[PDB]
Amino acid sequence: MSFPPQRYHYFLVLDFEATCDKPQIHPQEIIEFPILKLNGRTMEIESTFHMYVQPVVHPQLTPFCTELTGIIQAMVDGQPSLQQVLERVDEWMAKEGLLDPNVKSIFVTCGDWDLKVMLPGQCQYLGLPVADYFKQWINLKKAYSFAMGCWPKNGLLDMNKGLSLQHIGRPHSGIDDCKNIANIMKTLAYRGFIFKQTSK
Ligand SMILES: Nc1ncnc2c1ncn2[C@@H]1O[C@H](COP(=O)(O)O)[C@@H](O)[C@H]1O
Ligand SMILES: [Mn+2]
Numbered sequence: 001m002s003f004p005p006q007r008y009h010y011f012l013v014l015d016f017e018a019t020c021d022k023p024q025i026h027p028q029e030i031i032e033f034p035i036l037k038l039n040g041r042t043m044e045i046e047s048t049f050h051m052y053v054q055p056v057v058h059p060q061l062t063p064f065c066t067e068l069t070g071i072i073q074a075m076v077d078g079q080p081s082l083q084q085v086l087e088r089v090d091e092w093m094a095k096e097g098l099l100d101p102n103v104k105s106i107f108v109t110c111g112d113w114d115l116k117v118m119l120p121g122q123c124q125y126l127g128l129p130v131a132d133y134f135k136q137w138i139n140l141k142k143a144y145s146f147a148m149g150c151w152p153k154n155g156l157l158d159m160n161k162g163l164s165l166q167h168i169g170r171p172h173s174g175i176d177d178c179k180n181i182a183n184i185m186k187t188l189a190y191r192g193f194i195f196k197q198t199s200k
């Protein structure tokens, strides 16, 4: 087969960037919140959510963080905080039609960190409830391992290598990481893979 029927109407590709430092800052805070809505059958990008987020606990970005992500201070200054961004996300979900119980969608991330560690950890820190659509997801490294029969070593770069795909955009940009995840998904579906929830 090729581009088989999938179990979901849409895939929501997500890749946070967060405050960081050498050695690691504590706690980390989300500073970039991108979502790509993919057509569930063809994997084409149909809509994009993208907001930078103002960190509060450590409001000044370290030089390491800027070097790593490309995100400069003026991009987060004046932005809403995570709480407001999470409400913007919910409105975006509603307008996309994804809050319909008969429309099936699922988040896709490179690894488990984004939705297993980063978002629940910051939300608990903030005393915010986590929306239920953030609680199931597909780990692309785990899906790739089932599709290709091997464990990639360095996330997106090694998955692009095994699939002979040219990298899209700037590494460690949240939105560009999402596009690479989208591109890998399209190739896995081209090869006939059917995606399944991996989160426990
Ligand atoms: N090499 C690194 N050193 C320190 N922190 C990192 C590194 N790579 C990623 N991070 C942190 O993890 C976040 C997610 O990056 P990634 O998982 O590569 O998309 C970044 O925004 C940083 O906060
Ligand atoms: Mn990531």
Ligand SMILES: [Mn+2]
Residues within 6 Å of the ligand: 015, 016, 017, 172, 173, 174, 177
């Ligand atoms: Mn990233």
